């Protein structure tokens, strides 16, 4: 059923587009200045804040880049937003940029300070997918969460308590948790945890176990290809009418869109452009914990590890100066594409028979199997 699912999500994409365009028209930005992932970000956050303000806005004058610090009527923003979505709320839409931010953060940063202070092993990176993602996120917002993500929550919810309505949360938070697991025991053991009203160290210690079980017997976690507002704004402006032509977040749609995107980014004096593009690209598909081998395979070019990556973050801090600042064009194109999955595999070869698709192969017709016998460069982005 390609009617609701493909076209209803198109309608949520149209909203973000339309809105971004309107909002650019207010700031009186240029074309080059609307394609600046920097400005796009600021706008996206202005909105999520207002639906739950001001921000950094970079301008282009003869030669150099000027940063403007601006503020907007928190309600005006909310007004312009609905205008774009037909006066609807389109929580999906806000939630979408809620993820784009997530997926960018799960790749720009490593959240160790928090894992340990919770009592999780820092080496449990690959399980913290969406730890940044506000609880306000929707139902299809939590499905993107890693097993480890859930644990850090319950453990804190439990840790402060064990140190009214709060109960329905805990059980559900576990049901979700449990719905991540895809094996008998895994599934059953989650229940044995959900049994205690005041679950103390008994649970505290047990879930941590299950956290580690997922390192081997992974769960089902959905991945959503969520592109920056500018990319959708630009697309909408170019005529693409997604609600009518359909769109996906786990199909070929997102890759294809990024095959023509003209996104620019601010880049510090000593940073490597190629390295910058890599980052953004990995946030566009939630590939921050993917096997570097495969990421590079599909990417088309080396996908260098975080340590060897030359960049500190895409957003520009108030500390820095503009004099020594310039901007590059982000390389977001990829070689092939792949069905962003949810499954963690089980039996060691996973996704037996599943392959990669050419960017011409619109339909999922002919699959391609990668052979990794090769001089690779690692598997752990972190």
């Amino acid at each position: 059923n390609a009617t609701e699912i493909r076209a209803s999500v198109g309608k949520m994409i149209d909203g973000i587009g339309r809105f971004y365009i309107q909002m650019c028209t207010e700031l009186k930005l240029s074309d080059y200045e609307g394609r600046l992932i920097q400005n796009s970000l600021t706008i996206e956050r202005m909105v999520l804040s207002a639906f739950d303000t001001g921000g950094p806005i970079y301008r282009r004058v003869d030669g150099k880049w000027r940063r403007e610090l601006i503020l907007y009527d928190k309600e005006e923003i909310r007004r312009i937003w609905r205008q774009a979505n037909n006066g609807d709320d389109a929580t999906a839409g806000l939630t979408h940029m809620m993820i784009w931010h997530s997926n960018l953060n799960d790749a720009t940063y490593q959240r160790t300070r928090a894992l340990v202070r919770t009592g999780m092993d820092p080496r449990m990176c690959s399980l913290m997918q969406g730890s940044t993602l506000p609880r306000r996120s929707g139902a299809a917002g939590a499905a993107v969460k890693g097993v480890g993500t859930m644990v850090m929550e319950l453990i804190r919810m439990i840790k402060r308590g064990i140190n009214r309505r709060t109960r329905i949360a805990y059980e559900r938070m576990c049901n979700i948790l449990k719905g991540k697991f895809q094996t008998a025991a895994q599934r059953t053991m989650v229940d044995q945890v959900r049994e205690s009203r005041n679950p103390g160290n008994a649970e505290f210690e047990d879930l941590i176990f299950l956290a580690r079980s997922a390192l081997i017997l992974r769960g089902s976690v959905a991945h959503k290809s969520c592109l920056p507002a500018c990319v959708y704004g630009s697309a909408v402006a170019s005529g693409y009418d997604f609600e009518r032509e359909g769109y996906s977040l786990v199909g070929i749609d997102p890759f294809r869109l990024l095959q023509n995107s003209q996104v620019y980014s601010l880049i510090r004096p000593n940073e490597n452009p190629a390295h910058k593009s890599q980052l953004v690209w990995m946030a566009c598909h939630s590939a921050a914990f993917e096997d570097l081998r495969v990421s590079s395979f599909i990417r088309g070019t080396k996908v260098v590890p975080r340590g060897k990556l030359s960049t500190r973050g895409v957003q520009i801090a108030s500390n820095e100066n503009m004099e020594t600042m310039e901007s590059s064009t982000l390389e977001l194109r990829s070689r092939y594409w792949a069905i962003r999955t949810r499954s963690g595999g089980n039996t060691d070869v996973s996704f037996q028979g599943r392959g990669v698709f050419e960017l011409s192969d619109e339909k999922a017709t002919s699959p391609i199997v990668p052979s990794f016998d090769m001089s690779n460069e690692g598997s752990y982005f972190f």
Binding site: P122, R123, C125, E290, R340, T341, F351, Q352, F372, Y380
Partner: peptide, 19 residues
């Protein structure tokens, strides 16, 4: 250490999953 130990899979392909 302080590094990764397993790979979270993002795509559907024939891939030995590292841990």
């Amino acid at each position: 250490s302080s590094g990764q130990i397993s790979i979270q899979p993002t795509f559907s392909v024939q891939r030995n999953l590292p841990f």
